[PDB]
Amino acid sequence: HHHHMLLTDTQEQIREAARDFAQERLAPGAAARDREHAFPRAELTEMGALGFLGMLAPEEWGGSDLDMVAYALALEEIAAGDGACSTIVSVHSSVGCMPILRFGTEDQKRRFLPKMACGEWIGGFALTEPLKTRARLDGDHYVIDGSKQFITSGKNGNVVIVFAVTDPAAGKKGISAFIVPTDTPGYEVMSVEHKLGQHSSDTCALGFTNMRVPVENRLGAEGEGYKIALANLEGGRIGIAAQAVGMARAAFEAARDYARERITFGKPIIEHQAVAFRLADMATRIETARQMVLHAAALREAGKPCLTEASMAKLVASEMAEQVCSAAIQIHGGYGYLADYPVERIYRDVRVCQIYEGTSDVQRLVIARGL
Amino acid sequence: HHHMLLTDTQEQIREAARDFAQERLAPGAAARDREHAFPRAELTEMGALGFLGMLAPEEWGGSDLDMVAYALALEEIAAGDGACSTIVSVHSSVGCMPILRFGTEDQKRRFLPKMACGEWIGGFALTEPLKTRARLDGDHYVIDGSKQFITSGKNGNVVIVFAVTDPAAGKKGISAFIVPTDTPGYEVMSVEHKLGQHSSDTCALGFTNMRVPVENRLGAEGEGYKIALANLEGGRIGIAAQAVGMARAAFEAARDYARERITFGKPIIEHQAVAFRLADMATRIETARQMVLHAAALREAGKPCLTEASMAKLVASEMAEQVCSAAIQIHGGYGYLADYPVERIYRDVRVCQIYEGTSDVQRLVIARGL
């Protein structure tokens, strides 16, 4: 019999499969993709063949249809190999694929989900603005004019869910969602931002000018945009929480290894008390955050309310990860500040986990409302 | 004039350092970060204003400031450009001071005037991956070895090199050498790629058959260990001051962002969480600063202050990471972007906990003195 509150063998197998892939195929190029700001298209293609871009899609659409706990385990492994890659996957899965799955017509799902589930088409989500973006009905097309900011995969993605006002008098009831191929004429990347880290993943400002979108690409009814925009808060926040755990873990393992190789020289790490206790604290914080992330994922999988718990997980893991990554740098001494070791990059990569997908204060606000 | 408050001269130096840093260092800091560009032109302008001779006597072209004023100036320089403050801190405390204190009159004449006016930038090469050695050969020493993590090892002009002259004498067997960086045999093995302070070269050095005149040996044979430790306090005070300065620049950036992009000109106290975070940041900066200045006051008075300097360095460096990170958070999404200065200042300041004695080195010094 399966032990209560322990991972199933299938969940452990998925974790190991994600680990094997991330370590063998993502980690060796992670530093280079950081230096080059290079989108991991080749690696995403590989991942797609192995089911890692279809984890939240059902099998009938080409997905691997994982439970939410397994999905979190997989994202953690991917993040421990390459942080930016885990961002691209989390966004793709939770707010690229899921809105089309839940709100799409059968024909919209046929047209978009198989190529998204195998990772051929990478999905993005364009809600946030510098809503002023609007969509005007013109016969068999909507005409979209506006702009978006901080859009992950706005340039390298193939399909982006665009949110635009269709009735300015209806306020939050007057927004609609649109499935927009990124090669639609009038779709424009205004900028790819230079960031502190996760260089490999494009974060974009978009402009839409006279951008004609077929009425058959409207996701849901006119006015359903607000509901659609909020439909995956939990999945997204769980995913970013998992990636923060993964990056923290990678930095911890680097620091543990450096301690054994370069501080104690093979002797028990416990022989250097301060460094041993610091590593113990790091391990404890990582494990504790992980259990919060998996708890939230378990609630989501069961369809229970979990906005509070997902937000808690995202908050506690993102803040944990900066502390652990910084301690990983300290343990490396002078080498911690050098690009030759991975912990300075992981530090840079992880800092944005407290900022996107709801800033920490946005998380606190929803947690406070649900007390 | 209250004896625990800054003197008018100290405030004047702070204001002069501020005016230069804001006008001539801050506007170019982002570019020098992007381009990993040594601030040679800015250092020259600084030198002509006396900021590269702050620990040197006037007779050598220095401005001969008291330690409090020196600390104030370094905070200002750092708030303008973190990397530049490192270059100056190193140049003044372990470049100029060992030559001032231990140099012969002729050595001071040959080296201090150009270093004090900033034409020649000084570095300090002790740390190794000591195995570097110096063997006497007539009227030269021959030096062979290597050094790691050396600030200005490439872009500097004069580096104090530490080498073993008597392997049987242990920590009594080290000597110090004044070594122009264009000495044949002096080689930059690598300029490290760092998280931040890109503008300041941190170098691996190699010395191969490097012949140095006997007249460049700084102090007597065996005096090297003493010379190496001769400026622990002034070095740590300076690095403490630069952490305060970088923290302050990040705080000011977050304060301005709040005013322009969060409250839209309304009083910041109308947004309680951000107001309280900025209050805490301002408080931690001010508290660290007073510790730095207290350590500086003791040093100026010639009192024991290794504990206080180590405390100042420890407190300010840790404070600065926390305040710089808070500054990123206040910027929201923009905080993670290179178009705003706080991600760079965050990168720049992280090494303050690491060089000039790691945080745990500071704790050990503090503990053993209790």
List where CATH 2.40.110.10 sits in chain A.
123-221
Q: How many residues in chain A?
A: 371
| Backbone torsions φ then ψ of B301, nearest 5 degrees | -80, -5
Q: Tell me, what DSSP letter sits at residue B260?
A: I
Tokens of B279: 């209050």
Of B320, B330, B356, which Cα lies nearest the Cα of B79? B320
Taking CA atoms, A139 is separated from A213, A216, B235, in Å, by 11, 11, 73
- Interchain proximity A348–B347, CB inside 8 Å: yes
Q: Work out the angle between the directed axes of helices B26-35 and B67-80 (0-180°, nearest 10).
A: 70
| Backbone torsions φ then ψ of B191, nearest 5 degrees | -105, 115
- Interchain proximity A359–B149, CB inside 8 Å: no
- Interchain proximity B329–A193, CB inside 8 Å: no
Distance, C-alpha A339 to centroid of its chain:
24
- Interchain proximity B343–A195, CB inside 8 Å: yes
| Backbone torsions φ then ψ of B146, nearest 5 degrees | -155, 155
Residue A130, chain B, CB below 8 Å: the answer is no
Cross-strand partners of B151: B202
| Backbone torsions φ then ψ of B151, nearest 5 degrees | -65, 135
Taking CA atoms, A278 is separated from A103, A336, B349, in Å, by 48, 15, 21
A36 an active-site residue? no
List where CATH 1.10.540.10 sits in chain B.
1-121
List where CATH 1.10.540.10 sits in chain A.
1-122
Taking CA atoms, B21 is separated from B321, B355, B359, in Å, by 21, 23, 28
Strand A203-214 and strand A187-192: pairing?
antiparallel
> Residue B99: CB partners within 8 Å, gap ≥ 6?
B107, B108, B111, B112, B115, B122, B160, B178, B218
Q: Which residue of A has its CA nearest to B192?
A: A338
Give A176-193 as a DSSP string. EEEEEETTSTTEEEEEE-
Residue B346, chain A, CB below 8 Å: the answer is yes
- Which residues in chain A are closer than 8 Å to B355, comparing Cβ atoms? 334
Helix (H) or strand (E) holding A320: helix A307-331
Distance, C-alpha A329 to centroid of its chain:
24
Question: A332: helix, coil or strand?
Answer: coil
Tokens of B54: 């702050």
User: Nearest C-alpha of chain B: how many angstroms from A161?
Assistant: 20
- Distance of alpha carbon A169 from alpha carbon A220, whole angstroms: 19
What type of residue sits at position B135? Answer: R
Q: Does domain B122-220 have CATH number 2.20.25.10?
A: no
Question: A-B interface: how many C-beta pairs under 8 angstroms?
Answer: 77
Strand B140-151 and strand B133-137: pairing?
antiparallel
- Distance of alpha carbon B249 from alpha carbon B340, whole angstroms: 12
Of A90, A7, A63, which Cα lies nearest the Cα of A317? A90
What is the CATH class of A224-371? mainly alpha
From the list A322, A330, A344, the residue facing B353 with the nearest CB is A330
What would the CATH number be for the domain defined by A123-221?
A: 2.40.110.10
- Interchain proximity B329–A194, CB inside 8 Å: no
From the list A195, A326, A339, the residue facing B194 with the nearest CB is A339
- Interchain proximity A351–B358, CB inside 8 Å: no
- Interchain proximity B346–A193, CB inside 8 Å: no
From the list B336, B354, B360, the residue facing A196 with the nearest CB is B336
Q: Which of residues 25-84 of A touch B (CB under 8 A)?
A: none
Residue A170, chain B, CB below 8 Å: the answer is no
Of B65, B72, B56, which Cα lies nearest the Cα of B17? B72
Ramachandran sector of residue B34 (left: φ over 0; alpha: ψ -120 to 50; beta: rest): alpha
- Which residues in chain B are closer than 8 Å to A359, comparing Cβ atoms? 329, 332
Q: Tell me, what DSSP letter sits at residue A120?
A: S
Place of tokens 């969602």: A177
List where CATH 1.20.140.10 sits in chain B.
223-370
- Interchain proximity A338–B195, CB inside 8 Å: yes
List where CATH 2.40.110.10 sits in chain B.
122-220
- Interchain proximity A337–B329, CB inside 8 Å: no
Q: Which residue of B has its CA nearest to A357?
A: B333
Helix locations, chain B, DSSP H: 8-20, 26-35, 40-48, 67-80, 82-90, 97-102, 105-116, 224-229, 232-257, 272-300, 306-330, 342-349, 359-368
- Distance of alpha carbon A53 from alpha carbon A129, whole angstroms: 27
Q: Which residue of B has its CA nearest to A35?
A: B193
What type of residue sits at position B334? Answer: Y
Q: Which of B195, B276, B342 to probe the A interface (max A CBs under 10 A)?
A: B195
Experimental method: X-ray
| Backbone torsions φ then ψ of A91, nearest 5 degrees | -65, -50
User: Nearest C-alpha of chain B: how many angstroms from A335?
Assistant: 9
- Interchain proximity A337–B351, CB inside 8 Å: yes
List where CATH 1.20.140.10 sits in chain A.
224-371
Question: B176: helix, coil or strand?
Answer: strand
What would the CATH number be for the domain defined by A1-122?
A: 1.10.540.10
CATH level 3 topology of B1-121: Butyryl-Coa Dehydrogenase, subunit A; domain 1 (1.10.540)
What type of residue sits at position A133? Answer: T
Question: A227: helix, coil or strand?
Answer: helix
What type of residue sits at position A66? Answer: L
User: Nearest C-alpha of chain B: how many angstroms from A369?
Assistant: 16
- Interchain proximity B325–A360, CB inside 8 Å: no
Residue B147, chain A, CB below 8 Å: the answer is no
From the list B333, B336, B350, the residue facing A337 with the nearest CB is B350
What would the CATH number be for the domain defined by B223-370?
A: 1.20.140.10
Residue B354, chain A, CB below 8 Å: the answer is yes
Which resolution in angstroms does this entry have?
Answer: 1.8
Distance, C-alpha A101 to centroid of its chain:
18
Q: Which residue of A has its CA nearest to B272?
A: A361
Question: B265: helix, coil or strand?
Answer: coil
> Residue B231: CB partners within 8 Å, gap ≥ 6?
B93, B94, B97, B98
